[PDB]
Amino acid sequence: PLPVDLRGKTAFVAGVADSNGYGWAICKLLRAAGARVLVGTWPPVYSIFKKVFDKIYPLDAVFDTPQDVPPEVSSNYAGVGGFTISEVAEAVRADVGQIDILVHSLANGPEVTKPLLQTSRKGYLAAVSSSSYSFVSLLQHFLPLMKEGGSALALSYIALESDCRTLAFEAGRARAVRVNCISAGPLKELESDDVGRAALFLLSPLARAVTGATLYVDNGLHAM
Amino acid sequence: PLPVDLRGKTAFVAGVADSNGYGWAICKLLRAAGARVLVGTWPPVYSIFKKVFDKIYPLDAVFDTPQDVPPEVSSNYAGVGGFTISEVAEAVRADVGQIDILVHSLANGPEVTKPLLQTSRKGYLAAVSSSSYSFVSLLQHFLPLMKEGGSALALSYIALESDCRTLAFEAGRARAVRVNCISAGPLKELESDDVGRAALFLLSPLARAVTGATLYVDNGLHAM
Structure with a gap:
């Protein structure tokens, strides 16, 4: 029905701070679907890690x-x-x-x-x-x-x-790379896996015809 | 990762006209996930069927x-x-x-x-x-x-x-029913499978936190 096999693919996921975070959730969902998972973590939390994912790097995306x-x-x-x-x-x-x-x-x-x-x-x-x-x-x-x-x-x-629709256009002409966004509410209950599943879906061949979309995972919050 | 089990549930799909359409696609997808599928087909095409879905009705939604x-x-x-x-x-x-x-x-x-x-x-x-x-x-x-x-x-x-976000609000307060929309392009290309699969996602518990969403399944045509 909604088959997601990522085995041969590898992913880099930036912004993995804590356990009950959306980022961490996605790492599992991708790792579970078989993909290889590389993680970029805030330097501090990185050491308490270096001492789910196949490899981790320290990263301050700002x-x-x-x-x-x-x-x-x-x-x-x-x-x-x-x-x-x-x-x-x-x-x-x-x-x-x-x-x-x-x-x-x-x-x-x-x-x-x-x-x-x-x-x-x-x-x-x-x-x-x-x-x-x-x-x-x-x-x-x-x-x-x-x-x-x-x-x-x-x-x-x-x-x-x-930025989404624009980066979708720019990254598309560039390498035919889909770009999408999830706008979530804090975690009608909203659990990390709610975002993780919507994330997983967009990030897979299942959404091959989907790019430049912004999906609000906030139980109708946005525009309602 | 993206489990879709609709066994104990039933759906009414309106529109279903041809066999190479998104509608017919979704019937199969829902049925596949175990759901009971009720179909509303344009009266004319209905008489040909009366001779996937567990039941069909003649329907001119206009x-x-x-x-x-x-x-x-x-x-x-x-x-x-x-x-x-x-x-x-x-x-x-x-x-x-x-x-x-x-x-x-x-x-x-x-x-x-x-x-x-x-x-x-x-x-x-x-x-x-x-x-x-x-x-x-x-x-x-x-x-x-x-x-x-x-x-x-x-x-x-x-x-x-x-019009989608409005019906999402009204149906939300009413029966806590999610309402979403897909805006597809005509039939990486774009086949019924693409729409039907995005359809299946929004319609399942996977998108439980998603309502009022309009998703363009048109390879980036819209929004680019």
């Missing part, structure tokens, strides 16, 4: 290259091995050469919900950078490494409907 | 009550027995009493895509009526027979994003 990492954040993060997006993507390439699936688990609560008059330039751009741009970059740096017909999904929880 | 059927259509459609939406819904209720799934396959070609200045009132309202209202009515008359937590899907192929 940094693109070493030059963006401020001297303080730098030495802190100590002896971990490049955590910026360009560095992790290099590592993945050396380690597997090509991936079929790309997932970004992007949790963004505080800002971008705060009324504009109460905001600050630095804090407003930090939320844009962190809540939406990071995915653009992660895709930018991982796209040249994705098989044609690969699939990318950006997950946001707790309007990228733009 | 008519709500007998009084809507003009004498030219009455006498023609002959000896089929009540094909309006109110009459079919009555028959389904008598035969099974309650359904878990409702699907509408709407095919709307040339009309409604034609430039406004090039249209006529009668022809404009005729396209609204059958390309979108028919679903409102079909849902209006079937909702009372749907189990709480039921699932409804409007399929349009070859605008109604808010």
Whole structure:
């Protein structure tokens, strides 16, 4: 009925913080369906890991290259091995050469919900950078490494409907790579696996004709 | 990973005209997942069937009550027995009493895509009526027979994003029924299997947290 065999494919999933998170859920769903799973985890949580997935890398998706990492954040993060997006993507390439699936688990609560008059330039751009741009970059740096017909999904929880359709167009002409987004509510009950299943579906041949879609997994919350 | 077990559930699929359509596809998919499939077919094509689905009814979703059927259509459609939406819904209720799934396959070609200045009132309202209202009515008359937590899907192929979100809200407060829509392209390419599988996903417990969604199964055509 809804067959999902990912055995031969491998996936890189960015943004795996805790256990009861949507990101972790997806790792299982992909791992269960047979895919090979590479994970990019916030540097801190990475060490308490390096000491579900077939391989893990430290990754702070808000940094693109070493030059963006401020001297303080730098030495802190100590002896971990490049955590910026360009560095992790290099590592993945050396380690597997090509991936079929790309997932970004992007949790963004505080800002971008705060009324504009109460905001600050630095804090407003930090939320844009962190809540939406990071995915653009992660895709930018991982796209040249994705098989044609690969699939990318950006997950946001707790309007990228733009970047999505746009990145769907750009990544499509580029390598015929589907790009989709899931906008979830915090976890009419909503469990991680609710997002994990919708995620799994979009990320598989089952949705081969689906790209540029934003699906709200929030029990009717959005627009209702 | 994407288990779909509909055994103890029954569905009424409206539209089913040909054998190489998305509608027919979904009947098989639902049946395959174990569901009991009730079919509403255009009166004419129904007489050929009366000679996948566990039961079929003659149905012209553009008519709500007998009084809507003009004498030219009455006498023609002959000896089929009540094909309006109110009459079919009555028959389904008598035969099974309650359904878990409702699907509408709407095919709307040339009309409604034609430039406004090039249209006529009668022809404009005729396209609204059958390309979108028919679903409102079909849902209006079937909702009372749907189990709480039921699932409804409007399929349009070859605008109604808010009409979908609206019916999602109303049917939500009402019977806690999910309402979603697929906007497909004509028959990586695009085959019934693609739509039918996305249909199956939204209609199953897998998409339990999904309502008011409009998903374009058109290889990125729309939104790009």
